[PDB]
Amino acid sequence: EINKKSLEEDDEFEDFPIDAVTQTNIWEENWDDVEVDDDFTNELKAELDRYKRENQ
């Protein structure tokens, strides 16, 4: 057990040694568009199917 406060010392920037090709993309343009097989999704779809079947 311990009663110490929570804070991150490491977060503080290290020392400055200093004394425009900045066009780099780091974000996925279209996560949303991309479709891939997944267990959860299929589970959902399964449930949808069940519901549909149950009410006819």
Partner: protein
């Protein structure tokens, strides 16, 4: 002239808690004064010992109780001063807690009043910044946890008020709020404290709901809305609709498309009177004031 030592302060508070809470609806001013005096006499001595902690804690509890007792009653009282004293006691409590901690010491009821603290400025983010800093054992306490739940559930991205910066992706979970309020797991004082937001919660719930309805949608029945906003009875929904200029059709339903207000705060009217929830009243009636106020560990 002179200043009462801690022990007789504690004794006085004991008297109050043991004998005088029964007389509360009417004897509020008196008690308010006494409690304030007790609080002051401590700071005049520059005394932050366990007695001070205890006394302020119990005082905070009392204020929480009084809020409910008063709101329910037709007796005259100032809300702002009650809240004010509440706030003061809370801040002094916080600082004491901090001091004790930095000195390698512990307060047994800190979690509870950390929670209460969390409930006082429900939309103020600094209270979230703060609470994340406290030790695991405090952060993971049932009370702080529930407090946090409430804070999340209450957040709205649409909350409009002068000097308030709206933030993204807020839940606005009125449903869960009312569900939590009805839980047997919710400590009563907390509920009392939370009741202060019923009107705004309800307003934004109603507006949000309205925004989703199609033009020419039929008005919503009273029963539904009463359930949605856990109104006590028809009178409340009537009064509520009246206040916010929501047209009432057939005395059975409210046409929500008529709800046209920038904010929950009306510019040319004084705020709708505070209210309460029946369940919490009923719960109150099944316990003792003394029990509620003394419901903590010893210092």
């Amino acid at each position: 002239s002179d200043v009462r030592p801690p022990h007789i302060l504690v004794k006085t508070l004991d008297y109050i808690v043991d004998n005088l809470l029964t007389t509360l609806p009417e004897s509020e001013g008196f008690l308010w004064d006494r409690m304030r005096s007790i609080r002051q006499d401590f700071t005049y001595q520059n005394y932050s010992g366990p007695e001070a902690v205890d006394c302020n804690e119990r005082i905070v509890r009392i204020h929480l109780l009084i809020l409910h007792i008063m709101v329910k009653s037709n007796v005259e009282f100032s809300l702002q001063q009650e809240l004010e004293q509440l706030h003061k006691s809370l801040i002094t409590l916080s600082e004491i807690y901090d001091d004790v901690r930095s000195s390698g010491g512990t307060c047994p009821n800190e979690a509870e009043f950390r929670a209460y603290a969390l409930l006082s400025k429900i939309r103020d983010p600094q209270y979230d910044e703060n609470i994340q800093r406290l030790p695991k054992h405090i952060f993971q306490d049932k009370l702080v946890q529930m407090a946090l739940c409430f804070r999340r559930v209450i957040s709205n991205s649409a909350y409009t008020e002068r000097g308030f910066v709206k933030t993204e992706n807020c839940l606005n979970f009125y449903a869960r709020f009312f569900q939590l309020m009805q839980s047997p797991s919710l400590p009563l004082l907390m509920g009392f404290f939370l009741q202060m937001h019923l009107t705004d919660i309800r307003f934004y719930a109603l507006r949000a709901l309205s925004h989703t309805l199609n033009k020419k949608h039929k008005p919503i029945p009273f029963i539904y809305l009463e359930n949605m906003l856990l109104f006590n009875n028809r009178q409340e929904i009537i009064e509520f609709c009246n206040y916010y200029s929501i047209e009432i059709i057939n005395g059975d339903a409210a046409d929500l498309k008529t709800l046209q207000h920038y904010s929950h705060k009306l510019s040319e009217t004084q705020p709708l009177k505070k209210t309460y929830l029946t369940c919490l009243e009923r719960r109150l009636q099944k316990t003792t004031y003394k029990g509620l106020i003394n419901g903590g560990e010893d210092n």
